[PDB]
Amino acid sequence: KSEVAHRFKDLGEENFKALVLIAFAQYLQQCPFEDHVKLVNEVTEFAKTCVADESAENCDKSLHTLFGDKLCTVRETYGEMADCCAKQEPERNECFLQHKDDNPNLPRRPEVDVMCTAFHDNEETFLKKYLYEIARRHPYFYAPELLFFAKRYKAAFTECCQADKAACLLPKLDELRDEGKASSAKQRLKCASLQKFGERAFKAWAVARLSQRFPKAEFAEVSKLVTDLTKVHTECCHGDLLECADDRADLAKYICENQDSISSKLKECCEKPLLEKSHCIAEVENDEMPADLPSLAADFVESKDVCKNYAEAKDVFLGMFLYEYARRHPDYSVVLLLRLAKTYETTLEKCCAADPHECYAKVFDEFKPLVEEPQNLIKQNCELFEQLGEYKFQNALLVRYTKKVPQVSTPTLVEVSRNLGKVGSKCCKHPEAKRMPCAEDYLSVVLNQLCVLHEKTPVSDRVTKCCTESLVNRRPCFSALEVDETYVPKEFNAETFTFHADICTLSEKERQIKKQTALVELVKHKPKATKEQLKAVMDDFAAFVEKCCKADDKETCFAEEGKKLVAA
Ligand SMILES: N[C@@H](Cc1cc(I)c(Oc2cc(I)c(O)c(I)c2)c(I)c1)C(=O)O
Ligand SMILES: N[C@@H](Cc1cc(I)c(Oc2cc(I)c(O)c(I)c2)c(I)c1)C(=O)O
Ligand SMILES: N[C@@H](Cc1cc(I)c(Oc2cc(I)c(O)c(I)c2)c(I)c1)C(=O)O
Ligand SMILES: N[C@@H](Cc1cc(I)c(Oc2cc(I)c(O)c(I)c2)c(I)c1)C(=O)O
């Protein structure tokens, strides 16, 4: 009779408190740390009263009613601001969801010895700081995976803080934020899929992906798994985080009890601890594909029953087409497989209302150009990457995309282009047959970042079109954009280049980011400059910066010499 009691008992007090803190920090990203912990503790102690008697006052209230009521107990609007706390459920929860900010304007690592002192001072307060700061900067983070990150975070300190601490803690902390931002972007795509294109689009994506990983499983087994996984991500993406974690744990138990009807690669994943086992299953490699599978053309092109099966049970028949095609093509990206199933459905739509056997007899010819376009694209960029290396590969992609959509803001163009260029590092080391799913599905994740970053403040009609027209065609849409000829050159400002004392002591990574910022501004100012012309200007300006960083009075040099180039 009490839902808060049910989840407190299923998850245990430690994971309960952590998940409630994550939930509050994702809904109110600007609220100070001390105010959230205070609300968390009141919630936890009420939950204990309900475990002791599920008929006590208020113990019958929904989780949304209880969490929303707490958040409503604690500046300038410029005339525009939604008032979520004046709404009733379920409208109030929808209002909270609509104010999640993907780009929180919030500040961006103290000394190694300084952290170690705060750790042993209070471990528990130190770990909650880690959850709070990540959750408020990534408001769609997959909440059960964040628990697994917090445990690896706790283990790095419980080892390195106790000969040298810097050479022990800093490499580990560095892979925790790489692997942290990869995980965040990956889940932002699932949530955008469910919220903008609907449940039916998500389930197709999951049929395709689970059929590749589990090609020996029966179609009925894949469909059960997809139904359970869709419920989990629906919950995590609508802020039902206690339910999401409880159902994720239940799904892992089901998979591990039924290994022999699912995959032979699960042996070791299923012997690991609670959070580690779900994380293991999520990244398991594909199983071996059965030999001598019958031809696809036999059931889907040649059978005289094609139009009958499409009419009598359309969702099952089209789901079977996708399952059968995907299990025998681990070498295709998920979005390519979804494009083929859409083409097949359109064709039967047309042909079954006409000699249909003759109408759709040549449907496989339509698939060949869909397969060839991404194969050639990724063959070319890998050639370029191997020649140029990551930094200059990034700069090649940055000039291309700035010229496609020059209205997009400079920070967003730099961040997206850097991430697009990481695809060569990540995927070009694989042999041919392994490259398409690695590269084209990573590119979907980065292009979705461009879409959600731009949606907050739309300025480019072309970005809006490609992001709203069709989820699976996003990458071909962007690849096809030419240079905008209607863009008026941006005029010089100069505030971009004002001296700051930190520019003469940059790390290598932050040097690249400064140079990439200046290249975007240059293309926006001179959209017709050739490649040789851009290089000559770039190389002269970098030499100016190196000159004045060696001066007796740095600021004087920057001010005196910078003005000459401005009036040149
Ligand atoms: N490269 C893709 C492939 C992939 C997607 C899903 I969707 C999936 O099914 C699960 C099951 C559980 I349990 C999870 O916690 C999650 I997250 C996904 C599995 I196996 C693999 C990816 O991993 O996204
Ligand atoms: N030297 C090549 C020209 C070429 C330039 C770029 I820059 C490039 O990289 C991308 C990456 C993405 I993602 C795109 O959507 C696009 I369009 C281009 C590729 I591949 C090829 C030739 O002449 O064959
Ligand atoms: N105004 C900013 C600091 C800032 C100063 C300069 I001078 C600059 O311009 C370049 C151009 C090239 I080409 C380089 O290789 C480098 I390093 C810096 C940039 I971008 C940023 C602030 O207040 O923080
Ligand atoms: N005297 C010109 C103004 C002008 C100043 C600069 I300094 C400049 O050089 C750069 C180099 C980089 I690198 C940039 O990102 C940018 I924006 C401009 C250029 I070309 C033109 C006029 O009044 O028309």
Curated annotation (Swiss-Prot):
Residues that bind Zn(2+), according to the entry? H64, H238, D240
Binding of Ca(2+) 2, residues = D10, D246, D250
Q: What is the effect of changing D365N?
A: In Nagasaki-2
Phosphoserine is carried by which residues?
A: S2, S55, S62, S264, S409, S479
Major localisation = secreted
- The entry marks the following residues as binding (4Z,15Z)-bilirubin IXalpha, namely K231
Please tell me, according to the UniProt entry, what happens when changing E345K.
In Hiroshima-1
Q: Biological process GO terms, please?
A: cellular response to calcium ion starvation; cellular response to starvation; negative regulation of mitochondrial depolarization
* Pfam families for the chain: Serum_albumin (PF00273)
Upon changing D553N, the result is: In Fukuoka-1/Paris-2
Report the outcome of K362E: In Naskapi/Mersin/Komagome-1
How is the polypeptide modified once translated?
Glycated in diabetic patients.
Q: Keywords assigned by UniProt?
A: Calcium, Cleavage on pair of basic residues, Copper, Disease variant, Disulfide bond, Glycation, Glycoprotein, Lipid-binding, Metal-binding, Methylation, Phosphoprotein, Repeat, Secreted, Signal, Zinc
Q: In which tissues is it expressed?
A: Plasma.
| Domain of life of the native organism | Eukaryota
SMART domains per record: ALBUMIN
Disulfide bond entries: C50-C59, C72-C85, C84-C95, C116-C161, C160-C168, C191-C237, C236-C244, C256-C270, C269-C280, C307-C352, C351-C359, C382-C428, C427-C438, C451-C467, C466-C477, C504-C549, C548-C557
Q: Which GO MF terms does the UniProt record name? A: antioxidant activity; copper ion binding; DNA binding; enterobactin binding; exogenous protein binding; fatty acid binding; identical protein binding; protein-folding chaperone binding
Q: Which InterPro entries match?
A: ALB/AFP/VDB, Serum_albumin-like, Serum_albumin/AFP/Afamin, Serum_albumin_CS, Serum_albumin_N
- Where are the residues marked Not glycated as a site? 1, 17, 38, 61, 70, 87, 100, 128, 151, 165, 172, 181, 186, 196, 203, 231, 253, 265, 277, 350, 362, 379, 392, 404, 422, 426, 456, 465, 490, 509, 514, 528, 531, 547, 550, 554, 564
Complexes and interactors? Interacts with FCGRT; this interaction regulates ALB homeostasis. Interacts with TASOR. In plasma, occurs in a covalently-linked complex with chromophore-bound alpha-1-microglobulin with molar ratio 1:2 and 1:1; this interaction does not prevent fatty acid binding to ALB.
**Protein name (record):** Albumin
Supply the source organism for this entry: Homo sapiens
